[PDB]
């Protein structure tokens, strides 16, 4: 999104087909006119003519297949009752994939997800969230519903819900570079009651927000809350979040990342080979580099 | 003395632009007066009603929406579902 002034012309104009408001309208046009529209069921996709995971798959590859439409009734109608069926943790999932069914409908999507956001299950509240951003992710939106949507949530106790409102907003946010939502989640990467991988999460959201931006306090922020998160419980399984958060941030950069490796360096060698790597690689990432 | 202001509310692919004013003895329009329009226009309750304006959450009932920034352009989205009693 390029932010400008109004004082150009038809800079109403100007700004919508920026923030892709009519991308869902054309889209669900374009398919309507291929007669590409009716919701293809995952089943027919298996071609069954001769399992709590498999069904959560299904409903996944539904959610992809009629990803961007949001018209899809299997979640829709009987949505309540198919993640009651669910088992343990998909139903977040589950949410999450109507919220692909639904992305780029801002108006649709959250109407039909405003039902769900009140859900008993915590899985199913962080889902629903999950899906707001989804939903928002891409596409710009003059009053920006999902930094009012997720409030509570942004910084919210609840391990899940937090994940699922954080990964909303990096997915809308993501390439915005706001200044508001950076202020607003940075401090939630700062926050310590938080999980090794929700804080994982939140340098993810960060640095697809701040993509390509070299956003020196995030940079700071991330290094810092590497060193304050103590090196053995550090390089388990999931701080490998915060190096591609870096990388995310300078990408496309590249000479400048030997400032960051430097600050890095400190780190033990099992994580700190791998960062600054990653770093690297994104950094210099359509180069050809040899 | 009516203190109209320009306001461009969407809601499920439905969209108004509403020139509302301030009505119960408010120099400008708040959210009383906005929600007041709402239920009117739709019926749906301030409890689960949600108003949505730059990104900021619309939480107290008696904050001025005209103080928070409102002018005339602004647009604001309607989250909720139309009830009918």
Known sequence: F??????????????????????????????????????????????????????????????????????????????????????????????????????????????????????????????????????????????????????????????????????????????????????????????????????????LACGMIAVGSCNGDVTSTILQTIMEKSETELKDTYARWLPLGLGLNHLGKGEAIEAILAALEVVSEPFRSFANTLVDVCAYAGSGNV | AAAGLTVTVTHSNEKHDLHVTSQQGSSEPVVQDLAQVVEEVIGVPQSFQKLIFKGKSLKEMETPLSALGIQDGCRVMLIGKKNSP
Request: charged share 20%.
């Open chain 1, 2 to 203: 390029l932010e400008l002034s109004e004082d150009v012309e038809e800079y109403e104009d100007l700004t919508e087909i920026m923030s892709n408001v009519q991308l869902n309208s054309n889209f669900l046009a374009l398919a309507r006119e291929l007669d590409i529209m009716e919701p293809k069921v995952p089943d027919d996709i298996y071609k069954t003519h001769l399992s709590a995971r498999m069904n959560l798959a299904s409903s996944f590859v539904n959610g992809f297949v009629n990803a961007a439409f949001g018209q899809d009734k299997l979640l829709t109608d009987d949505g309540n009752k198919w993640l009651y069926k669910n088992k343990d943790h998909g139903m977040l999932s589950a949410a999450a994939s109507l919220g692909m069914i639904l992305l780029w409908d801002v108006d649709g999507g959250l109407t039909q997800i405003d039902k769900y956001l009140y859900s008993s299950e915590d899985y199913i509240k962080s889902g629903a969230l999950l899906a707001c951003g989804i939903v928002n992710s891409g596409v710009r939106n003059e009053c920006d519903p999902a930094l009012a949507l997720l409030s509570d949530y942004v910084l919210h106790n609840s391990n899940t819900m937090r994940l699922g409102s954080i990964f909303g907003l990096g997915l809308a946010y993501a390439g915005s570079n706001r200044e508001d939502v950076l202020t607003l989640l940075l401090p939630v990467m700062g926050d310590s009651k938080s999980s090794m991988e929700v804080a994982g999460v939140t340098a």
